[PDB]
Amino acid sequence: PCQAHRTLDEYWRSTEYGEGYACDTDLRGWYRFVGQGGARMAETCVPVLRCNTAAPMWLNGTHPSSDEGIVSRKACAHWSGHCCLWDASVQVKACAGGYYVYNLTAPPECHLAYCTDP
Amino acid sequence: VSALNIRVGGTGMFTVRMALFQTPSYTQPYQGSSVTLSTEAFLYVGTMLDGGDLSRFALLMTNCYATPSSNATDPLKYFIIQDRCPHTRDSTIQVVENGESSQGRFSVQMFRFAGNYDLVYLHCEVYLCDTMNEKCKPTCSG
Amino acid sequence: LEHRLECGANDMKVSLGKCQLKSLGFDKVFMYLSDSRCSGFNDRDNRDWVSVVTPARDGPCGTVLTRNETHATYSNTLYLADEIIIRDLNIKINFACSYPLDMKVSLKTALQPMVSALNIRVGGTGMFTVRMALFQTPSYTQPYQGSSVTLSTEAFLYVGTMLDGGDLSRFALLMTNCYATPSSNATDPLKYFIIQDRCPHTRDSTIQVVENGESSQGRFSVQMFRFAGNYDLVYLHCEVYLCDTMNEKCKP
Amino acid sequence: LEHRLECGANDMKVSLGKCQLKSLGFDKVFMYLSDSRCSGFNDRDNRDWVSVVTPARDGPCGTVLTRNETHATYSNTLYLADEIIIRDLNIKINFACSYPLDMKVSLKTALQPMVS
Ligand SMILES: *[C@@H]1O[C@H](CO)[C@@H](O[C@@H]2O[C@H](CO)[C@@H](O[C@@H]3O[C@H](CO)[C@@H](O)[C@H](O[C@H]4O[C@H](CO)[C@@H](O)[C@H](O)[C@@H]4O)[C@@H]3O)[C@H](O)[C@H]2NC(C)=O)[C@H](O)[C@H]1NC(C)=O
Ligand SMILES: *[C@@H]1O[C@H](CO)[C@@H](O[C@@H]2O[C@H](CO)[C@@H](O[C@@H]3O[C@H](CO)[C@@H](O)[C@H](O[C@H]4O[C@H](CO)[C@@H](O)[C@H](O)[C@@H]4O)[C@@H]3O)[C@H](O)[C@H]2NC(C)=O)[C@H](O)[C@H]1NC(C)=O
Ligand SMILES: *[C@@H]1O[C@H](CO)[C@@H](O[C@@H]2O[C@H](CO)[C@@H](O)[C@H](O)[C@H]2NC(C)=O)[C@H](O)[C@H]1NC(C)=O
Ligand SMILES: *[C@@H]1O[C@H](CO)[C@@H](O[C@@H]2O[C@H](CO)[C@@H](O)[C@H](O)[C@H]2NC(C)=O)[C@H](O)[C@H]1NC(C)=O
Ligand SMILES: *[C@@H]1O[C@H](CO)[C@@H](O[C@@H]2O[C@H](CO)[C@@H](O)[C@H](O)[C@H]2NC(C)=O)[C@H](O)[C@H]1NC(C)=O
Ligand SMILES: *[C@@H]1O[C@H](CO)[C@@H](O)[C@H](O)[C@H]1NC(C)=O
């Protein structure tokens, strides 16, 4: 968990990036978002065509604070005008310190990717 | 001592590839067959060289273009890279390394051909150069 | 003797079949390249074969690079011997194969853009040109230019209609019904129909029709007549219809 | 904008004022039919007009034909661009004019018989 994870230093994942086509089907494991992109995922459904993707996704609900353990959340995906139209399963865990980890699964259909709010 | 000389010959093709990169800074390749973009999106493509003798040979793009079909000799061409230099009349065109090393990359804002065309293909033509025999860096100005 | 050289991307392989080298007199094959350490080995692709492998570089095993404007040639020399020391006759296979320096590469993925579009719709209408003509000679081969034509009742009367408009291949000029009226206007009450309801009015035997509704032009022949009363003017008219030559037929 | 379309007896043409499109922002225009070989050209009758000419038939330059029981229509799409590549504001002028199937004809010559 907090010690066994792969970092992602990507500055194009922020909710400010123009538009891309990247889709994350090879994302496997627990990740620690690091860099100018941000440390935590999106908390509200970000508008369409952002995060270097056509249909970005977001973590629905609120992040768990310190000392919460393993939590189950369902990362919704905004597309076509109906926020959270496809669903993916994520497992967030807080960490000792100012950072998080996520169980990043593959979205059901490609041209979906996660964001990080700066 | 007398010698007998048998002379034989042959021909071979180096291997040069093209790939579409899913991210800026050209990090991961694309494993799809058709990609749907918006015209406001940038395009991040590049060429590799797997043939061999990368020490003496530097990959370099003499000319690259786009055609609305798979056919590469199509009369309709938009020269993305014209005569070893990136297009200057289009501001959204930039190259990173052309002839510097064994891999060349460039980026172009996506377009769509005017008329009854709904697809855009890409084709370059590569000219390998010797790193030490001659000077390969293309530096052009208006 | 058979030679097979595969000048691959980075491997230059020279091979000689041992099944023939045995019969050639070499009971044990020594396969030295220009560098004595690039000794040959055994492989089996189509049969038991001996071969050497030299990387396609500048001097990994003695290869020498010769550069031309359009090609790069990699030169080397083989060496054969039935033992370590030769006295009878040296054997050298001066093998070399060149690569090109001008290639073409194509992106293998179709790339489809999307963009917002606006569609302004503009309409209109035109008219197919159909002109009616008078023939004063048989076989329908000579038109009449004058405005006024005076001809006896007994003599026949030949009238032709021809479609001048485009798309002649797709459209055949049908002739719904013709009539003759003693006035320029087509609204006149008393009329003399020549062809009634797509087929000729046959109550008068002096009427005959040729090539009606089959080509771009139709025609008919009808005897001259005098309207009852003090009507010395006969202005005949007709209206035509167009058929789709494949969906239906215009033969009545 | 302005689009004058005259549906002639044999062929149809769509014309656009050069001054109007120059003011609209197109220095040089590319008029493309359903097939790009019907590129627009220049012709002047009362002002500068850039125009396209298409035969009024089924297929000579992509003109679709769909005839119903009473009229027959010849529909072709038009494309306009200030360059070879469109990058924003793709423009399509969907033009079509229909011809009637029922027409009236009459001789222009006065006839005069006589009976003894
Ligand atoms: C720079 O160097 C390149 C690489 O060598 C060179 O290309 C060579 O051109 C020569 C001249 O034509 C070719 O020489 C061969 O010589 C004999 C006849 O003299 C034949 O073996 C060849 O003809 C055959 O060519 C084909 C076989 O590959 C077949 O069509 C057929 O069998 C012909 O008979 C040929 O003439 C030599 O083969 C090529 N090298 C290749 C093709 O790899 C180039 O010309 C040089 N440029 C200069 C000097 O400006
Ligand atoms: C067979 O197909 C033909 C050709 O498509 C069709 O004739 C069309 O009829 C419709 C319905 O009347 C017309 O549609 C137009 O639609 C809008 C309004 O909805 C207007 O542009 C038109 O009204 C105009 O009418 C006059 C035209 O100048 C003017 O008074 C004025 O501009 C009005 O706005 C019109 O309603 C269409 O234009 C015609 N096509 C013509 C006239 O060429 C026909 O009805 C079909 N027959 C069938 C289905 O049985
Ligand atoms: C995130 O957490 C889950 C739950 O611990 C990990 O394992 C999955 O557990 C469910 C429930 O039994 C299984 O159905 C899944 O098959 C498990 N996943 C795999 C890949 O086997 C899950 O792996 C974690 N995800 C990441 C991306 O690390
Ligand atoms: C690629 O495009 C050309 C042009 O459309 C195709 O047709 C050839 O056109 C050239 C002139 O451009 C003629 O000289 C040739 O005779 C045409 N035929 C051939 C077979 O070359 C050409 O066929 C297309 N190639 C492929 C592989 O589809
Ligand atoms: C052509 O002339 C006639 C005769 O003056 C005009 O009026 C028609 O007259 C006939 C015979 O009485 C009637 O059957 C028609 O109904 C009349 N048509 C009308 C009133 O519209 C006729 O209008 C003239 N036609 C034209 C096109 O001018
Ligand atoms: C995810 O959380 C959002 C934000 O409160 C909520 O609207 C949505 O219903 C949640 N998703 C599901 C599947 O309940």
Side-chain angles (χ1 to χ4, degrees):
Chain A
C2 290
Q3 73 284 50
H5 61 69
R6 317 159 56 142
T7 197
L8 298 172
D9 168 355
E10 289 172 358
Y11 90 107
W12 27 273
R13 261 205 217 272
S14 44
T15 56
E16 210 262 323
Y17 211 50
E19 158 154 1
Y21 39 103
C23 95
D24 286 16
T25 77
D26 36 358
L27 248 53
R28 293 182 183 174
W30 305 54
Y31 296 81
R32 182 209 209 280
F33 291 113
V34 162
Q36 314 208 358
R40 291 193 297 274
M41 214 138 47
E43 30 198 278
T44 36
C45 89
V46 58
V48 61
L49 295 174
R50 293 272 183 66
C51 325
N52 195 256
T53 324
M57 339 212 294
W58 59 296
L59 209 174
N60 85 310
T62 88
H63 305 49
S65 84
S66 86
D67 179 72
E68 200 74 354
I70 303 268
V71 175
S72 209
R73 302 251 167 184
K74 284 182 51 213
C76 280
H78 179 201
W79 176 239
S80 155
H82 184 5
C83 281
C84 161
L85 172 162
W86 307 295
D87 263 8
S89 322
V90 78
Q91 309 290 323
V92 82
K93 202 198 205 173
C95 277
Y99 75 100
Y100 293 80
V101 299
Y102 311 90
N103 289 33
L104 296 193
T105 196
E109 330 169 78
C110 156
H111 262 41
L112 305 206
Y114 302 87
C115 318
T116 54
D117 165 53
Chain B
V1 56
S2 74
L4 169 148
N5 286 38
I6 301 177
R7 183 163 138 83
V8 296
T11 326
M13 283 320 267
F14 275 145
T15 58
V16 49
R17 288 168 55 254
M18 225 176 184
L20 176 48
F21 283 124
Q22 242 191 22
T23 89
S25 186
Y26 315 70
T27 79
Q28 335 173 309
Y30 199 75
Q31 312 204 139
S33 176
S34 184
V35 57
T36 305
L37 280 93
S38 99
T39 301
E40 211 93 337
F42 276 72
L43 200 52
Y44 288 120
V45 317
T47 40
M48 319 308 222
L49 176 46
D50 315 332
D53 194 358
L54 303 67
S55 43
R56 255 190 74 89
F57 285 147
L59 188 147
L60 152 71
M61 324 206 192
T62 43
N63 271 318
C64 208
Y65 53 53
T67 58
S69 79
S70 64
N71 192 300
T73 52
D74 194 295
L76 194 35
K77 283 187 236 289
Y78 180 58
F79 281 140
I80 165 63
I81 286 198
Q82 179 90 91
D83 259 329
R84 334 173 56 111
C85 324
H87 248 13
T88 46
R89 67 158 130 69
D90 186 13
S91 66
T92 192
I93 294 169
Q94 49 204 341
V95 291
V96 279
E97 48 214 299
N98 194 31
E100 291 216 340
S101 80
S102 72
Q103 146 153 359
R105 310 155 325 173
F106 67 96
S107 64
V108 63
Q109 191 162 345
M110 169 78 62
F111 36 57
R112 173 186 180 277
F113 279 133
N116 185 24
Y117 301 131
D118 273 347
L119 297 170
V120 165
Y121 288 91
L122 276 169
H123 321 278
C124 297
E125 61 205 319
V126 192
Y127 158 69
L128 312 166
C129 85
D130 299 355
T131 165
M132 56 204 40
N133 306 39
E134 71 314 350
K135 293 179 179 179
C136 313
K137 183 178 179 180
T139 305
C140 329
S141 193
Chain C
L1 74 157
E2 70 190 85
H3 323 146
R4 162 182 130 196
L5 153 65
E6 291 112 300
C7 214
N10 49 14
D11 277 29
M12 291 205 318
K13 162 188 281 271
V14 201
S15 307
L16 303 179
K18 81 166 60 26
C19 295
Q20 149 179 75
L21 272 205
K22 155 43 61 173
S23 177
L24 204 30
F26 317 103
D27 53 359
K28 84 182 91 83
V29 175
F30 277 98
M31 254 282 187
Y32 296 75
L33 213 80
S34 190
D35 202 321
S36 323
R37 52 179 36 83
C38 237
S39 162
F41 70 95
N42 311 70
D43 70 337
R44 197 180 116 194
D45 311 308
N46 94 337
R47 274 316 288 256
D48 312 358
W49 280 28
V50 316
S51 77
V52 307
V53 178
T54 189
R57 302 217 324 278
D58 189 299
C61 261
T63 321
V64 46
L65 179 141
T66 52
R67 206 271 287 251
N68 242 14
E69 161 46 13
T70 70
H71 283 67
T73 322
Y74 286 19
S75 156
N76 217 315
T77 315
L78 206 65
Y79 288 111
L80 295 174
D82 68 335
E83 78 198 308
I84 173 67
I85 294 169
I86 50 196
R87 177 52 195 160
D88 287 300
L89 157 76
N90 197 16
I91 288 174
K92 308 191 295 190
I93 293 185
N94 189 353
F95 82 96
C97 39
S98 38
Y99 302 149
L101 293 195
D102 296 318
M103 339 162 78
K104 305 182 252 304
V105 57
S106 74
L107 182 43
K108 54 202 71 63
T109 168
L111 165 153
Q112 164 184 3
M114 289 256 209
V115 66
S116 76
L118 77 80
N119 331 304
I120 66 181
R121 162 162 258 279
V122 55
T125 167
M127 265 173 24
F128 279 147
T129 299
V130 190
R131 148 211 60 219
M132 161 155 278
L134 177 63
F135 292 146
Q136 71 264 38
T137 70
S139 173
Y140 323 109
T141 44
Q142 258 189 52
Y144 204 137
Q145 313 333 110
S147 172
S148 174
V149 296
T150 299
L151 154 79
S152 195
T153 298
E154 48 249 53
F156 256 36
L157 151 67
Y158 313 139
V159 159
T161 287
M162 49 205 167
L163 188 148
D164 275 312
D167 206 37
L168 304 107
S169 45
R170 277 280 311 255
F171 284 153
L173 180 135
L174 207 150
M175 290 257 289
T176 51
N177 44 28
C178 287
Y179 56 52
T181 44
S183 185
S184 294
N185 303 5
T187 79
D188 214 37
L190 79 159
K191 317 164 72 41
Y192 198 178
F193 282 112
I194 276 155
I195 61 171
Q196 249 300 295
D197 195 355
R198 208 157 292 94
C199 101
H201 155 273
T202 39
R203 317 303 175 278
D204 44 8
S205 73
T206 72
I207 280 198
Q208 189 254 15
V209 54
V210 306
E211 197 192 1
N212 193 65
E214 293 177 350
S215 86
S216 154
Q217 50 95 50
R219 31 168 71 108
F220 56 69
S221 70
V222 296
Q223 103 288 358
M224 181 95 88
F225 42 76
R226 159 71 170 227
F227 282 107
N230 63 344
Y231 293 10
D232 38 43
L233 285 180
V234 179
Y235 307 180
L236 62 151
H237 331 267
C238 208
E239 81 285 39
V240 317
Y241 174 64
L242 313 185
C243 36
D244 202 347
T245 204
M246 326 80 85
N247 194 296
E248 72 295 17
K249 30 168 275 304
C250 337
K251 197 47 219 71
Chain D
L1 68 152
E2 189 269 349
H3 33 72
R4 181 177 181 170
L5 176 169
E6 32 195 284
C7 210
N10 216 271
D11 72 355
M12 52 162 57
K13 90 146 54 65
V14 187
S15 322
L16 283 87
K18 279 228 279 223
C19 58
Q20 284 304 316
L21 49 77
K22 206 266 295 183
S23 212
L24 214 54
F26 316 132
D27 184 1
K28 46 162 164 179
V29 316
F30 285 58
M31 311 215 68
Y32 284 113
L33 267 283
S34 211
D35 325 287
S36 324
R37 272 170 309 287
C38 282
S39 172
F41 57 85
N42 308 265
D43 73 319
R44 332 158 82 262
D45 43 14
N46 73 356
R47 79 199 75 153
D48 262 358
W49 295 85
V50 86
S51 324
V52 295
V53 187
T54 297
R57 274 174 269 114
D58 200 356
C61 203
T63 284
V64 198
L65 161 49
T66 326
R67 63 151 290 287
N68 62 0
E69 171 56 340
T70 279
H71 278 71
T73 189
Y74 291 150
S75 323
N76 210 301
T77 319
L78 181 94
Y79 296 61
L80 188 157
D82 43 18
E83 215 78 19
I84 327 185
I85 38 183
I86 218 61
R87 203 164 270 148
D88 49 282
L89 204 30
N90 176 81
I91 280 194
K92 322 208 314 214
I93 306 194
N94 288 29
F95 71 86
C97 38
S98 38
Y99 299 100
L101 268 67
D102 312 350
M103 326 209 49
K104 325 295 213 72
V105 293
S106 296
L107 316 90
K108 315 313 187 302
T109 59
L111 192 144
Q112 176 164 348
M114 83 304 298
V115 157
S116 65

